[PDB]
């Protein structure tokens, strides 16, 4: 089953997640309205394109790791 949706402001950025060139996403994440590619691993961990080699437990964790990575910068859409 899909993870729950989420919506919060994290380090000044709006991050949203919801169940739904790249893979058929089952789950979408957005940072200030720009979609961020994320992916689920077989063990249930998640990654995003800007932290792809570093599994974290949930899509919100992946979204937060992306905001951490971006250090304020806008995201470019994939």
């Amino acid at each position: 089953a899909a993870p729950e949706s989420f919506d919060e402001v994290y380090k000044g950025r709006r991050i949203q997640g919801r169940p739904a060139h790249e893979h058929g996403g089952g789950y979408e994440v957005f940072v200030d309205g720009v979609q961020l590619h994320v992916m689920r691993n077989a063990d249930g961990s998640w990654i995003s394109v800007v932290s792809h080699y570093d599994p974290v437990p949930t899509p919100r964790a992946a979204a937060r790791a992306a905001v951490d990575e971006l250090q304020g910068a806008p995201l470019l859409p994939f």
């Binding site: 060139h21 893979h23 394109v49 800007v50 932290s51 792809h52 570093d54 990575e69 995201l75 470019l76």
Partner: protein, 276 residues
């Protein structure tokens, strides 16, 4: 063609390598390697088609990708070959790899911007074009997101694994391939990407020239693995949905199979490769 440990290059081998890489960037050819890798990163999935990553073909796929990149370098300067970075031996920020005459060092703390070396944004010679993070300068945070690079003893524990790969042939697998890739166990290749940080931590990781040196050593470790396990070979060997079997062709090239890439000596040798 001999692939050499980066630590052993002469000053003018380093010079020639850097100039060839900068020419591939200037001419527009470099960025399409970045783009190809990010497309496979985003499409390779544990539950569906997977070719470049999180699958048995992770190793032949990157071997062929590096061959394509090395051939592009040689079209610019035929003397150039890809060096490799043994991150188990050259494991600190003070290694010569990260000197201003080679790859440049770590990024400053404020924004991770690399400030020295030929790939520093200030040179005007290394625009980051293919990107997800919108900033356009090379970034690194060596040792910032993970404490240490793998050690020789950790690599040996992975080389001792006998099975090439195992069902379900993905990031959950036991077996050599997934332990080398790093999704399970002590973690070799993924951890190195995280340790460099910056673009190397992302799907557009070939934006950093160290990408090639990292994968050239991952590639060497597959060769070492073969010599440790001359009785063990690529799996699976047929009929596996979503996974590239031994004699199946590989995207994006389509004209090459894992089978064609198991023996690297058809393409290059290493400066040193322990005989079994």
């Amino acid at each position: 063609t001999v692939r050499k440990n980066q630590a052993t290059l002469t000053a003018d081998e380093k010079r020639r390598f850097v100039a060839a890489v900068l020419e591939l960037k200037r001419s527009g050819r470099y960025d399409e390697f970045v783009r190809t890798h990010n497309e496979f990163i985003m499409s390779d999935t544990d539950s569906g088609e997977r070719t470049g990553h999180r699958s048995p073909s992770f190793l032949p796929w990157h071997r062929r990708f590096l061959l394509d990149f090395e051939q592009a370098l040689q079209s610019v300067d035929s003397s150039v070959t890809l060096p490799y970075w043994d991150w188990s031996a050259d494991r600190t920020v003070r290694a010569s790899l990260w000197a201003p005459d080679f790859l440049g060092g770590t990024g400053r703390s404020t924004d991770g911007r690399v400030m020295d070396g030929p790939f520093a944004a200030s040179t005007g010679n290394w625009p980051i074009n293919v990107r997800v993070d919108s900033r356009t300068y090379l970034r690194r945070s060596l040792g910032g997101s993970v404490a240490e690079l793998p050690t020789r003893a950790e690599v040996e524990s992975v080389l001792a694994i006998s099975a090439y790969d195992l069902p379900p042939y993905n990031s959950a697998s036991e077996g050599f391939r997934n332990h080398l890739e790093g999704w399970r166990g002590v973690n070799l290749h993924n951890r190195v990407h995280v340790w460099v940080g910056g673009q190397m931590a992302t799907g557009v990781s070939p934006n950093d020239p160290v990408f090639w040196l990292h994968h050239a050593y991952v590639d060497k470790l597959w060769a070492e693995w073969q010599r440790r396990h001359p009785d063990s070979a690529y799996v699976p060997t047929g009929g596996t949905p979503d996974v590239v079997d031994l004699n199946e062709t590989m995207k994006p090239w389509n004209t090459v199979r894992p089978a064609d890439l198991l023996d690297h000596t058809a393409y290059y040798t290493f400066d040193a490769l322990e005989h079994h």
